[model samples]
Target: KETAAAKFERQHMDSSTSAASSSNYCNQMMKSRNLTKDRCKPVNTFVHESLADVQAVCSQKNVACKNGQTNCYQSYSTMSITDCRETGSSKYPNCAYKTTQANKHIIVACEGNPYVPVHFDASV
Candidate 1:
């Protein structure tokens, strides 16, 4: 059996990436809900990972990942990305490569069998 974070690491290359930033996730969540950072302090006091991290596993498995988007996905976890080429660009313009607007959740699936994505919706 593996913890969500552990599974993420074995499933991919780097595991410590998100483990280091776990605090930011709770902080942002608390701030978004108008709660003090300390309000979620106790929550953060423990090791609480985000849904974003879970999604990063999928994103890494997807071909949609670009630039260093994979690691960005692990860091912010709550971000979304678009292939700029579709819009005549390279990657999403300006905004975070790790942001999603409407709490959107996407699963990055490769061509077919045993699919996995590099990242997915980590929106607010």
Candidate 2:
């Protein structure tokens, strides 16, 4: 069965070896990840760092999550990430995505007994 943590990795992790980021990176990745399935997702993010590196953010201090909860934590270190934004002309069945990449501190929501990340809040 899939857990929240695993689903997060499935949707966001792009641990491919660092290289010249490709033009169709999002198009390829989003489809492979199912965010571009029958109904395309409007916006999605993919992180280039190791899962361990990204998970380390959960140990940081608490921040407010947008949903009126305080389970969020922000990373002290900056990380490289890419955002897949759907094109305006995109429609269901065959979706198109535009790629945007940058480095930023990560914000995420932590949960469970050991206190690990279950959701990515934002890039800041």
Candidate 3:
């Protein structure tokens, strides 16, 4: 069984990458991460930071989650990230995506006594 924190890591973390990131990065990563097998994920994000750094956001002030839960925290620093948006040409098992890069304060949901990030809520 996979923990929410572990699932969050696979779905969002991408600590190491390259300076020469091709436009095809999203297409490859979406598949490489096995997100394309079931159905094309319409959108996703990858955070280019250490897992420790991300987990630390749990210590920040809490904000309301989109669904009205007050368990979300926003990162203090704007972090490097990439957004993958599915293209019109995309389909299950053959997903295609457009990659866009940015820097933003990540918002996440944390849980448990250990208090680690379990869901990537948003960014601002």
Candidate 4:
């Protein structure tokens, strides 16, 4: 079974992508990461930073989750990330994604010992 922490890494971590030049980056990655299984993920993010840096976000400023959860935290510094949004014309098995890169403060949900990130909530 895939743990939440491991799932987060597989879905969001993309350390090798310093900059995105290809519009198809998300299209390929979202599928390769298996996020397109059964149905397309409407929206997702890929963090281009070290695992330690992303983990450290759990110790950053605490914030209220949009859903009113207290486990959410915001990154202290802007992070390099790529947002993948499913295009309006997208359909199952032919999922199309729009790739967008930006530097923003990331919001994440954390849990358990050592307090590593368990879910990527959003970016602002």
What digit string (tens of lDDT, one per residue) describes model 4 on residues 1-124? Answer: 9999999999999988886679999999999899998999999999999999999999999999989999999998999999999999999999999999899999999999878999999999
If ranked by TM-score, best first, what sequence of candidates would result?
4, 3, 2, 1
lDDT of 4 at 116: 90
Residue lDDT tens for model 3, 26-70:
888888787776688899999888888888999986889988999
The CA lDDT at 33 in model 3 is 83
Decoy 3 TM-score against native: 0.93
Tell me, by lDDT, which candidate is best.
Answer: 4
TM-score of each: 0.19, 0.92, 0.93, 0.97
Any residue pairs clashing in model 2, and if so which? none
* Candidate-wise lDDT, in order: 0.30, 0.83, 0.86, 0.93
Tens digit of per-residue lDDT, candidate 1, span 58-100: 4443333444343332232432321111112213221111211
- The stretch of ten residues in a row with the least summed lDDT in candidate 4 is 13-22
User: Among these predicted structures, which one has the highest TM-score?
Assistant: 4
- lDDT digits (tens) for residues 37-80 of candidate 2: 56899988888888888788888767898787899998887788
TM-score of 4: 0.97
TM-score between candidate 1 and the true structure: 0.19
Model 2 segments beyond 4 Å from truth? none
Q: What are the RMSDs of all candidates, in order?
A: 14.5, 1.4, 1.5, 0.8
